[PDB]
């Protein structure tokens, strides 16, 4: 209206830098996560806010996010000083050391951009993680990300805000993991007595949701079948996961023995056969490690199943149906199920108009 206005538009570019982290760790708690976080993190928010960027489109790629690589190295660096095994077998080399039992419960960690950088964040609720996001925004720090190490099932994570989401670097390539995100957590109650409970009816629907999302991805005319792990290491074949310092290996066959869209009492609560193990394969690198025997007889751990790691079978034969089995192993997929909407960017001089 005769009042020419000059805008200073922001300019950024994809980049990589060492991020820091923030946690609600306590300097009086002697559990490993709190101990590590304390000496290795910053106090928290406490009222986080983001800068919505109107009518801006940005491209993401969860499968090539250097935020993951950094988090992975941190969780590794955590276990090194935390869970001390009695024996460590790596590369024809054998090591023996003390192995004290220690309290072990994951604490949410926020990864933050340092001075000069920023972190774009997708606000689009149903976002696959690779492609344009037409609803981004800026943040100082990510959200609370628990370093939950495990396979088959993703625990204590983040739920989809709308419908069940599935993500894969290549749905066509059958060797590729299918990270799954639930919009409704399913409780899995564990115990040192060697079993794990899961509501049957709830988990049933949970599979119908996933199935419908998969049938959609591979033609809405294919029958969706779930089957047990096709084989591998104990940490892959069973729902491997940590719970109070002890490593649990739970049979998951009763979970993944369903057939959907096919044609074609009644357990009240699926009970999974479980067992701790002193001798386990390493996720850090290649090798094995042996730990001490369990201590207290009270080992109860209740967690929320918020995600799944599946793999498809396929092949030049499977027509009219698809087969999906539990999977996982690469802990990076675990990270990518949380760090999928983020992206660190370098900030530079503004551009006039």
């Amino acid at each position, epitope marked *: 209206l005769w009042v020419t206005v000059y805008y200073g538009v922001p300019v950024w570019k994809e980049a990589t830098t060492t991020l820091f982290c923030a946690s609600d760790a306590k300097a009086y708690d002697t559990e490993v996560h709190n101990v590590w976080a304390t000496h290795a993190c910053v106090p928290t928010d406490p009222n986080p806010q983001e800068v919505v960027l109107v009518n801006v489109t940005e491209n993401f790629n969860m499968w090539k996010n250097d935020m993951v690589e950094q988090m992975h190295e941190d969780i590794i660096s955590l276990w090194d000083q935390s869970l001390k095994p*009695c*024996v460590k077998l790596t590369g024809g080399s*054998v090591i*023996t*050391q*003390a*192995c*004290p039992k220690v309290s072990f419960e994951p604490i949410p960690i926020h990864y933050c951009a340092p001075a000069g950088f920023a972190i774009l964040k997708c606000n689009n609720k149903t976002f696959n993680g690779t492609g344009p996001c037409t609803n981004v925004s800026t943040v100082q720090c990510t959200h609370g990300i628990r370093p939950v190490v495990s396979s088959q099932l993703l625990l204590n994570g983040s739920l989809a805000e709308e419908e069940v989401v599935i993500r894969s670097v290549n749905f066509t390539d059958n060797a590729k993991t299918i990270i799954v995100q639930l919009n409704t957590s399913v409780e899995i109650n564990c115990t040192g007595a060697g079993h794990c409970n899961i509501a049957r009816a709830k988990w049933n629907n949970t599979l119908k949701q996933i199935a419908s999302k998969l049938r959609e991805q591979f033609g809405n005319n294919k029958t969706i079948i779930f089957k047990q792990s096709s084989g591998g290491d*104990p940490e892959i074949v069973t729902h491997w996961f940590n719970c109070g310092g002890e490593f649990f290996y739970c049979n998951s066959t009763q979970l993944f023995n369903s057939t959907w869209f096919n044609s074609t009492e009644g357990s009240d609560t699926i009970t999974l056969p479980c*067992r701790i*193990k*002193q*001798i386990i394969n390493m996720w850090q690198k290649v090798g*094995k490690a*042996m*730990y*001490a*025997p369990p201590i207290s007889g009270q080992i109860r751990c209740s967690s929320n199943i918020t995600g799944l790691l599946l793999t498809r079978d396929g092949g030049n034969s499977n027509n009219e149906s698809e087969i999906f089995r539990p999977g996982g192993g690469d802990m990076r997929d675990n990270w990518r199920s949380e760090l999928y909407k983020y992206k660190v960017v370098k900030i530079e001089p503004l551009g006039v108009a």
Partner: antibody, heavy 119, light 107 residues
Framework: EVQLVQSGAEVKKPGATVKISCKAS????????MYWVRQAPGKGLEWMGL????????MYAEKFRGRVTITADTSTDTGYLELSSLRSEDTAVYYC????????????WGQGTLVSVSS | DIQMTQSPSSVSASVGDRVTITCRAS??????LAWYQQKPGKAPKLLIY???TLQSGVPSRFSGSGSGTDFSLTINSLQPEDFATYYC????????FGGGTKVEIKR
């Protein structure tokens, strides 16, 4: 009730490879570790290795690595033990033990298996 | 591997006497230790597990203490059927045995 019944004495020449057994009874075999120990004539006990039958996870002492092998036929509740490249100082009694009560020590033992290796 | 070193190698004592034999790991192994008795011509007998816990059906005059690296088995009123060879043993992962300690009589 619980028991570990090994095999009989065996004679071998240097360089041979012996493989003794240890049929177990009185408990669920595949749910517990099994350990192997040998004892030279009038000398101290000497551990050799262990194994979890379920996943066949094995551990060996340094003095035997890449020369000894422990397995466990889960179907017949039997455990075996192989020793490649036998020498003259391998002449000893071989025990097998277990711990069906999980005290982390050897509670049950075998009667023993004398292995004599000479020219 | 981790070394278990027990001493003395031999010790002579009379009946009623009180005897102490010690063990020592080259690395911390907590309270995961075990003591065995073994008389000539037969298989070893579990005495103590968890360094201090007495095995069932074993005379109360037997007891072991210690934690971490330094341990010790001790017999109060020594008996005629207590003269044998005793062994300690790491029990947390590997199961290395100590050299051995022979408790013979005394005359």
């Amino acid at each position: 009730e619980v028991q570990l019944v090994q095999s009989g004495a065996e004679v071998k020449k240097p360089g041979a490879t012996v493989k003794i057994s240890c049929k177990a009874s009185g408990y669920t075999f595949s749910d517990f570790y099994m350990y192997w120990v040998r004892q030279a004539p009038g000398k101290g006990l000497e551990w050799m290795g262990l194994i979890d039958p379920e996943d066949a996870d094995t551990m060996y002492a340094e003095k035997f690595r890449g020369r000894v092998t422990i397995t466990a036929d889960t179907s017949t509740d039997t455990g075996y033990l192989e020793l490649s490249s036998l020498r003259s100082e391998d002449t000893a009694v071989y025990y097998c033990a277990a711990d069906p009560w999980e005290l982390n020590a050897f509670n049950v033992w075998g009667q023993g298996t004398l292995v004599s290796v000479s020219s | 591997d981790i070394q278990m070193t027990q001493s003395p190698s031999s010790v002579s004592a009379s009946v009623g006497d009180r005897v102490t034999i010690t063990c020592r790991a080259s690395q911390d192994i907590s309270t995961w230790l075990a003591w065995y008795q073994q008389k000539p011509g037969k298989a070893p007998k579990l005495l103590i597990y968890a360094a201090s816990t007495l095995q069932s059906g074993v005379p109360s005059r037997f007891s072991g203490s210690g934690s971490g690296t330094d341990f010790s088995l001790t017999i109060n009123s020594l008996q005629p059927e207590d003269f044998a060879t005793y062994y300690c043993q790491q029990a947390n992962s590997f199961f290395t045995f100590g050299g051995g300690t022979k408790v013979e009589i005394k005359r």
